Amino acid sequence: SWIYPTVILCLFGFFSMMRPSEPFLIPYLSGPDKNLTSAEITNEIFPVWTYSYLVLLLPVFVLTDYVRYKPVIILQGISFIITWLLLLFGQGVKTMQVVEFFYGMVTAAEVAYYAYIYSVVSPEHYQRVSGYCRSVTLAAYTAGSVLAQLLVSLANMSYFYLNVISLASVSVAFLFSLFLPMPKKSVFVQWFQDLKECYSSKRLFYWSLWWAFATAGFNQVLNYVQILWDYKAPSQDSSIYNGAVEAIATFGGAVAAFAVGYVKVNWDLLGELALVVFSVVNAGSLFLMHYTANIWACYAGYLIFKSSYMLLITIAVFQIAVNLNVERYALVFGINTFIALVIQTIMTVIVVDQRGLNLPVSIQFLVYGSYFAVIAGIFLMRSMYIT
Numbered sequence: 001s002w003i004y005p006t007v008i009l010c011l012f013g014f015f016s017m018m019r020p021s022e023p024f025l026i027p028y029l030s031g032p033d034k035n036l037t038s039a040e041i042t043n044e045i046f047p048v049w050t051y052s053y054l055v056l057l058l059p060v061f062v063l064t065d066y067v068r069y070k071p072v073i074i075l076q077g078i079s080f081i082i083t084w085l086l087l088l089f090g091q092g093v094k095t096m097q098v099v100e101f102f103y104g105m106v107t108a109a110e111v112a113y114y115a116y117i118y119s120v121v122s123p124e125h126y127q128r129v130s131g132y133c134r135s136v137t138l139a140a141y142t143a144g145s146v147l148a149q150l151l152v153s154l155a156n157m158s159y160f161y162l163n164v165i166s167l168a169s170v171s172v173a174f175l176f177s178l179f180l181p182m183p184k185k186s187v188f189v190q191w192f193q194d195l196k197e198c199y200s201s202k203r204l205f206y207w208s209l210w211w212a213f214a215t216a217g218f219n220q221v222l223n224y225v226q227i228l229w230d231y232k233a234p235s236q237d238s239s240i241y242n243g244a245v246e247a248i249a250t251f252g253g254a255v256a257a258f259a260v261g262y263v264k265v266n267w268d269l270l271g272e273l274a275l276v277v278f279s280v281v282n283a284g285s286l287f288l289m290h291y292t293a294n295i296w297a298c299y300a301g302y303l304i305f306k307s308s309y310m311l312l313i314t315i316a317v318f319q320i321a322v323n324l325n326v327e328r329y330a331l332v333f334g335i336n337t338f339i340a341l342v343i344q345t346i347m348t349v350i351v352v353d354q355r356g357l358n359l360p361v362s363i364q365f366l367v368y369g370s371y372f373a374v375i376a377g378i379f380l381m382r383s384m385y386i387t
């Protein structure tokens with residue numbers, strides 16, 4: 001039944017997302033072993049990841065369903081070993097840009113990871129599958145965070161050995177991906193025409209429209225929430241307080257994802273209400289993070305925002321999967337992720353980049369909260385127009 005593929009994919013998504021080095025990527029790169037500078041990391045290394053993410057997302061949503069979702073997962077696994085093997089023993093900006101290219105490949109094939117299990121289980125399980133899988137990834141993340149924060153604070157473990165542990169983790173995920181059950185088989189304009197058949201499904205464009213826009217803002221908030229926390233209360237100890245808080249925010253999000261899979265509720269007649277309510281919650285949390293000048297209130301707002309968004313995206317992925325009525329699960333997921341990345345890149349250029357308005361982190365989260373309020377109101381107004 002659904003138990004074996006779900007268990008194997010959950011193990012893969014745990015041991016692949018359980019990375020102790022992820023919280024300490026910036027200190028590792030600009031440290032005594034990697035020996036880089038923040039100018040080179042932010043300007044010459046990090047944008048390579050976004051460029052590679054877009055470029056390698058293109059074939060992910062073009063070719064994942066045709067190859068039956070397994071080689072792209074195995075490609076993600078192999079890119080996981082390559083990324084961390086180069087990150088362990090790579091020097092200078094030239095090798096770190098290759099690391100970012102392979103991490104872009106990894107994040108692009110995450111779409112295949114998400115769509116594979118929908119390609120393997122029957123639709124009646126799509127809800128449970130939607131929660132568990134997503135949940136475990138978030139669980140992995142918080143586990144990794146703890147596995148970092150404990151070790152660096154209790155075992156005096158260096159960041160290099162954190163990356164060694166991360167490589168050991170993602171190599172186990174590669175072995176688990178090797179044992180995934182293989183899904184069963186089955187001009188330019190024609191492809192687009194098929195896309196027209198794929199996005200004509202019921203409530204799929206609306207859920208995809210939320211996915212394309214909400215997750216761009218979610219990624220922006222994830223990027224700049226640490227900056228907002230540092231601005232709200234500048235402390236040297238915040239390194240041990242910020243990431244730990246994120247671990248609580250991720251775990252809560254994990255719980256929210258587990259709420260979708262476990263709790264049996266008809267999401268067809270409750271999808272719009274959940275979307276509007278939890279988008280209002282997202283906007284209210286984001287406004288709470290900025291407007292209130294309390295670090296604990298901002299922490300609670302971020303926890304609520306991440307939890308609400310993870311619950312909503314679990315619902316979105318589930319509802320897109322069941323209503324798709326075509327086998328092209330990764331085409332829709334990949335296109336949603338690509339549009340989300342394009343929107344996030346445009347918003348990053350506009351609101352925070354020096355080439356744009358260069359808004360400080362104080363006004364940045366007011367902008368993000370208003371962005372999510374616009375999303376909520378557009379979906380709130382649509383419900384009123386329907387009724």
Ligand SMILES: Cc1ncc(C[n+]2csc(CCO)c2C)c(N)n1
Nearest residue numbers: 025026045046049099100103223224
């Ligand atoms: C190996 C690796 N992991 C994650 C990121 C993404 N990332 C890490 S911190 C951050 C936010 C900066 O404001 C970005 C873009 C990357 N580039 N390389």
